[model samples]
Target: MKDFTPTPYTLECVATGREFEDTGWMLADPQCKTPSLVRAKYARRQLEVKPDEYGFYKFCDWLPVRRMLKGSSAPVTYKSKGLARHLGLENLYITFNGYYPAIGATMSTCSFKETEAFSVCARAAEDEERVLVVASAGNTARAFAKVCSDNHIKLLLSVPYDNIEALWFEHPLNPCVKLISCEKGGDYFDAIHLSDIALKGPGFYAEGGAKNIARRDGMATTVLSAVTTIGRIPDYYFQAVGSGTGAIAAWEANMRLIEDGRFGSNTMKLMVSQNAPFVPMYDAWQAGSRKMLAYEDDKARRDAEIIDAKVLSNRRPPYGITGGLYDALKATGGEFFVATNAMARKARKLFKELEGVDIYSASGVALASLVNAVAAGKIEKDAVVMLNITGGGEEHFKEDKELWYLKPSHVFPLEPDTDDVVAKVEALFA
Candidate 1:
């Protein structure tokens, strides 16, 4: 492909607008909307072409930063009997990512967020004064920190106190990144609330939601990569979602891939899963309604007490947006499933036994969804399938003594008096 620079950033809505920044943050400008490249209407299928010498190294070199498992090749591995058989599926393939490229595949992130991080950081740092801020439960923060450390960029990570333990490197925190954990009565949403306030300074920018063209485009790589590895899009696509952004990204990518008309994976079914009790999108999709009316009374209170990775609980999902999750589901005729903690544990064990990899709870939730789909006769046996094993396996990292870990920054109360919290946090940075 031509070594062309991505178009300038815009402030378009992900649901209504189309313009996007390299960092994957999006904006909708009426003027820019007409000819903006970020808008799907104007998006060219240029990823199919090989990048030129300069652009190739620029974008491809950063792929390693995400830790692509080497040697993952065609016909990766798929068990046809589980859910695919139940759904009457015969062309199913499960593209596992927990340890990608195990024997033949080329790349995989413990968390798919790494794909967004590499593309976002690489493009932002190309030649600009940019500071990226993100909210994470654990994986995204680690991916961004790893990317920032590798690229020498500045990143600010805001997460709840419960999530801080997972982001710590090992010892002696990296100076390139700032970590803040929201305290009592706070969840992932609370952290995002504070970040919205903190990231408004000069040169500070937040990563756009699923609307960000870069993120959606970058995430499309998973589907693209899977198709290339498996020679076709599996009959069904599965993944665990907290925000539904990744799944939305995949849906968009598949749409583009179909438009490409060359490597068309026959209209793959999208089956997205979320943890039960706190499943906003699941309830919305199951209800077959786009409007999300959350009952923040008894169920909400009970959900608040249970912390199954607070980041995954999004009270307000993108279901109501024009091109949001609701639209994606309706467009693809997809279904939503809920996975519980107990089910997720069983999934983790089953995956380890079958694939020899220990996955995280989020991934387990996804696996459980697939299992449920099978038991419920929603998925046919022998159908093509892909399972996204999002995270885990840091236990082996200790074997490498050279790997360093950073101390957690701090966790503060999610109070209206957060200015005081910021003051105390700034003191730590000083």
Candidate 2:
């Protein structure tokens, strides 16, 4: 084990371009007061494609993880014949991340969150005895739980009680991965609050949400895979934004690919969308303002309840922060759209009928935006396009696999003091 060598990469501040070595999932540069995302600077300028390689580890040269975990999955990309014909686009590609085995998408949790979970856990493995804590609405929690359990990485996941159903896995739970649930009536924000309190304890580390370099770079694999498959950068990149982290990841990945000199030098236009009634980032982008308004008031909360895609209900997104969604869009000359519930449902139905696979609600929102773009003549009919289907295949996954439900080891109030929650979490490790 001492003779093993991991892929070489340096962490650099997006603002200052200052580089440093990995220091246990460090979010931002300690010396830089301004908010900035740390990007991975790989030693390899050119990607060496091993024909035998599969999954995200193939792009390990760019990912922050130092070790490889078993059963890690990658995003699957293929040209969309069905949806492209329906949308009247000549060059449309779909990067599917889910459990559709026919296309080789083996994400058992049926989401791209698996990529983030595997990368973050593999990075955390570099420091032995440290436990990772993550807070999620549903998909993220399920992804992390599955990855950590399979790899024997200790993790403490927090989610609302209503989302407990989303925590099921194809395999039995590993004792190392502990789960905590917030009481009924809680949302993703409440789960985040509980995780924050739990992180105050020693020997426990926060997964850093969108701030984690491992996570951002991990999701970048989707774009890398798309470019590799397409043989060049696409003219437009489309996805549904929750916290807008995936769009930022795609932008950062395109930057690295451009520097690699193989993919075209042009930055792909980011066409990100949000579900209606909970679109703070969309509202801010439409206003041409960098700063996003808070959606925490009573009216916003009520509107959030009516949203079709609950995952896109992030009230406080990483919009105005340095090196965040705003910079990603502005840097790439990108635009945002809002997909109504009706539009998303229609798109999802159309995709399933034509594409022969099911997609999640968030993916439906993205598809609806693409439909709108085509209708409004926003994009060229013949230009290359990549649509990121962030998640799907739950209906397919259920047909063949049995789900093992994860029970919470502890439950906590949404508004507990740091010390009290810390003590309770510490007791679990003992």
Candidate 3:
């Protein structure tokens, strides 16, 4: 590990008003001493995107990055012609995060989760001895796996055994990346539990999810791409949420754009969605409750299993905390939407027919929500809107030919001891 330093940015906790330098993967209650979303305040008040730089790094003026990570390209935004004509909307823009190389979105993972993976992996200094631990079973697992492997960052990935197939890649992974899994049909919570056990060890560190300013700001680049392309903030911004992290990030990015004074002052109305039956955020928002209502573990897992987009099944989203999704909703007058499996399927089909790309189920959910919003008359046709297709371009990427697989090095039972995980995971590194 060589010497390294963080880029110029101070982390400010929304609740405590505490500000400090980043040590990478720093979480709340560590220095914030309480619960709150921590944000990176870059020294550059005015963002200056480059013609040379692409992807989230294009907005590096506001990114909390140590250096650029490989295998990244911009979240391409363009005014929708086919989809706009179909929806009868004049000013609709689609910010696509996927591997549609023909259209210049080179996120090979085919998910917006890459935005977070690339940013967080770069934000942490290469000199750190700790191996970063990430827990996911779907798009996120694939995204982090790609970034960490490509950048030669040591990573311990915990995924559910049932969803292990999501680790497909176009090439071999570096030895620095390792995979482990929880057995049976256990859901993402099970994957999270395994990572939590590994995170307690001496040489393992948890990837700060919502608290890491790098992760949030990285996801924020979608909004940056749209606002910069449109020369102003849109009246509405639409996407699907698992943890609502991206929605909050978009709101934060809008704040920065407004302060930049180049984009219009309007805060985009965050229209975020969740898959039906796994709709905790939707219920919470509709009930006007900041606190997420209790969802039984078994029921939550069942709902996740049944949903079209398993990635949207976060039972414990950071929705209520200070500067969290709740604050973003209140700030932007955001509304929650829900889409059934059938709706998502129809939306995906429609989007493919109109936009000429294959989108994943999560993206389908977001598109379905936009369709619902229009049908319900929640948004006007003439309203300037930003539709975030969080992931797509699968068919386009697959056309490149054969794909490879990253088999798990270790597999845990439904429940595993922390000491066992610590010792075995350490042996993989040693």
Candidate 4:
């Protein structure tokens, strides 16, 4: 295998259908400038699951990354007995992505974001000179930090100061991993803006959000895990969306499965949710609009601060873009649900009592939406369903490992010039 090109894959412009090579951080195709996500068209059309491989890398046949990272755990898909019996579903499967080793999940971060973290990090060349700049509300920051630390990849994380607590790790990270705070008043979007400055500098590259095929294909592994375990694609796919990237990834994976001619050509309806009161994706879906309605920063941050799932608070989701959540929802006849904070709280307890594994608040939001779907009769009792617990087993994770956190090496001004910010972030590594 080549060091730089470990895997063979080409990038496809979702809109124009133009295919090209990955230029490291290619989010868009210059030939097709329409607002659309670029999908990685892997050379290996048929998936041959490797017996020697486990976790995210097991499905590396479809991954965009050149190399596989260590310490990665695959999302485990198990038939749900308690939650299924409670909801009166005959064929319900739970794809758990967290730190429950008892169920065969070994993701130390206790977040499915590891799926993306591993893929994105592997896609970065081992000797790449530029540092990766990632911005997140909470879990994504933690997930990327962990992978970069363990793998010794130089990563600069920009997380909201308020959500810095989520950066805690099993042990102190390598000095190669430096973190910066976006301060208290800013939300996830603001954090993105902060990282954008660093990206403009010569030494940094954007980890590529929804546009990164590696990240999407990494996340698509959840659906791969579910379908491979179930032996076919389920009728419904459930999850909670901050950027709705995971749902889109699931849709992409479903198409590949159909192409493989193994999993029956059944397209799973995307049943994605967002926490209520901070629900931009839900609002746009409810309004029956392709575009995400405008949400002011101050009001959005206020809503974000109160939500139980702080990670599900993306004011600007990839809903309106072509080949984005809007198209995925439209294609699958999917619908979005609004999970109230109270509903998420109850769902968290219910999942623990029934499934016997503690889940994160974001997973609770997904579970609550599934409950809502069942109660509304949106899902049939006999139809096969797969609930994507985006993240869980945090309480379970803490019991197994003592946590240490990376304090922000630098505190960036909420709104600073690109040049000024670049110099400061440079000295962080220097």
Candidate 5:
């Protein structure tokens, strides 16, 4: 037993096919100038599910992190009887990542973003004294705050002032977690801009959005859980996207499963949706273009602001990047749909009544897309389908635990200089 050794994985560039050491949250190849996402190449090609292990870490054979937190939450998948009957689908599986205890999901943040947070923090822990800085609309910050607070990993989170109410946790926040607000009347994009500036300082590391293998692999657990539970990969995958990162993750995970030879060697069609007022990716996809267009003007921004699904409003998504959403969608013969606020509201109400659980607004958008797909006959009634309910169970979560709101310690301008921001962040820790 002493002589036994664990197999490690290497990071490989998708474009150049270059492999690098599993160091940390690597964004791109240092040697190659071409922008691409680096994927994890594990020595273990076959997945060995450890039923006794904790959470998604059971699939650590494929994850890049060095360690996994004990009892970390994993996505739960179950056959949706009510929803399946309502939609007239024979096999509809719901992979939920919220606080639904009935189905064994225990993500305190009530979002699949917790999976990304845990994996990112675990990988960052490999480097000593490195502090993670992230910007989010809401759920991502709350997820990271909870994981970082629980594991004593240092994290700095920046979110728009309007989203502060969404930063509450089920447990008390640890002192190591710091919250900041983008106070100068900015949105999610501005918060991301602030995070980028803050990361330029020493000792601060950017939570590489979409590009981080750890985050992507963490999200891949949703697909992995669904496939393992269903005994094979589904024929269709459905989800709502802000950045479309989770859809990319599902595509990547399905690719790996196909290679494993146990799951049916077929690609799952990606059926993704975006909220109507800010549906940049959907517009681009519908136009048959690889590049996403910038918001037309200030009016577009204001229009997006009024939408209920604000979390899906990413001004800049990794659509055109190599190994990104565009490539994944193209490879899987995917289609994008747009959902109006009224449709999302109807879907939310229907899901609550049928599934007996409350879901996030973003999840409502996903349900709406699935409904649209059914009406358009995009998917067959007998096809195995997995719907990634990206986030939900807030109402259920609040019922079980006391909510602890995270108050921001600093209110910073949206686009301050790197030096001033760095100095303030340094003092924040000091």
Candidate 6:
């Protein structure tokens, strides 16, 4: 056990034949846009895998999620009945990540961004010279802030003012934490642009943009968690995305589970939903190419307007990245759908009526797409399916008022020249 390294088993790349690292993150050939998968590393003679140094065997391992309330609830299975019936599935499972007990599944921006945050923070911990600096819409910022705060890792968060408010946390002030605002004048991408400059400073590590393996691997846990719980992998996977990171994570996780030989099944068909009017990735995926021109004219302006308030919107998503969502869909024979704001709201109502859970707007977008997919006959009635309820705990969250939030300790309007901002940050850290 002591000799075991917590690495995942390997599947070669389809395009380049490179071995994929199975430690939660997908490894792809630098030049190709395909993914390679590996099996979960365990603490046995063959793999000599053991529990993590932190006491968990697998960093992205699964723990059964308890019902929203305790004692009065049964063990929440990954396979959800409502979704199964809705999708016309003989068996349907849902990866629930909201306010649950001890095993808090959702700590990321408002979804399971914590999955990615935890993995990225763990990897960042391996480096001593670098402190993490990230730009987020809202959830990623909050998730990274909490992760870095808990780990005592220095983090500077750059977020649009409209979105930043949603990401506040009540934590004992740490000199290592820094926050910057994009004001009302900037959009989500501008915040990202600002963070890129911030990363240039000494002792700063960028969250690896979309290419970060930790972020992807952490997200992959949602899939792993669901599959392990259901005792079987579904034939289809569904979720909404601004950047499609979650979908990519699910694809990568399922690929690994396939290698484990435990799941007696093949790859799950990936189904991704996107907010319409800004769904570049969705448009591109449906068009059967990587082109994002469908919404180019509206990209900058729409992003500034809607994404200012909605942080999950990515102006230039990484759907084209190697081993990214694009390639994953192509390989798995998946489909994409786009949901208008109106459609998403309707889906939210449907879920509430049937399942008695409130879903966030983003999660609604995923549901909307699922609805559309079913209507279009893109998903079969008999296939086993898994739907990721990315978020659904606001009402429950407000009920428990122990949550703490930090005031805007400092606010700096976005500046093309970040020198003054950087200097102020340096002085604060010093």
Index of the highest-lDDT prediction: 4
Q: Write the per-residue lDDT of candidate 5 for residues 235-254, one digit (tens) a residue.
A: 99999999899999999999
By TM-score, how accurate is candidate 2?
Answer: 0.95
Q: Rate the local accuracy (lDDT) of all candidates.
A: 0.60, 0.85, 0.85, 0.88, 0.85, 0.62
Q: What TM-score fits each model?
A: 0.80, 0.95, 0.95, 0.97, 0.95, 0.80
Model 2 stretches astray by more than 4 angstroms: 1-4
What lDDT tens digits, residue by residue, belong to model 1 across residues 3-100?
A: 44443333344444544433333334444433222334423443343332332123232121222211221113444454344345566555544334
Q: For every model in order, what is the number of clashing pairs?
A: 41, 0, 2, 1, 0, 14
Could you say which candidate leads in TM-score?
4
- Candidate 1 vs candidate 2: the lDDT winner is 2
lDDT of 3 by residue, 150-259 (tens): 77789999888878877889889899999998886678878888888888878888886787787888888899889888888999999999889999999999988888
Tens digits of per-residue lDDT for model 2 on 1-430? 2333576777888879898987666788898888887777888778875443445687777877677777778898999988999888999999999979888888888999988988887777555787889988788888888888777788899987866887777778888889888876666677787888888889888888889988888888899889999999999999999899999999988998899987779999999999988888999999889898656655665665687887887666778888899999999999999999999999889888998889988999999999999999998999999999999988988886777898888777657767778888898877
Please, what are the lDDT tens digits per residue for candidate 4 over residues 344-389?
9999999999999899899999999999999998888899999998
Q: What is the lDDT for 55 in model 3?
A: 50
Model 4 quality (TM-score): 0.97
Write the number of the candidate with greater lDDT, choosing between 3 and 6: 3
- Candidate 4 has its poorest 10 consecutive residues by lDDT at 1-10
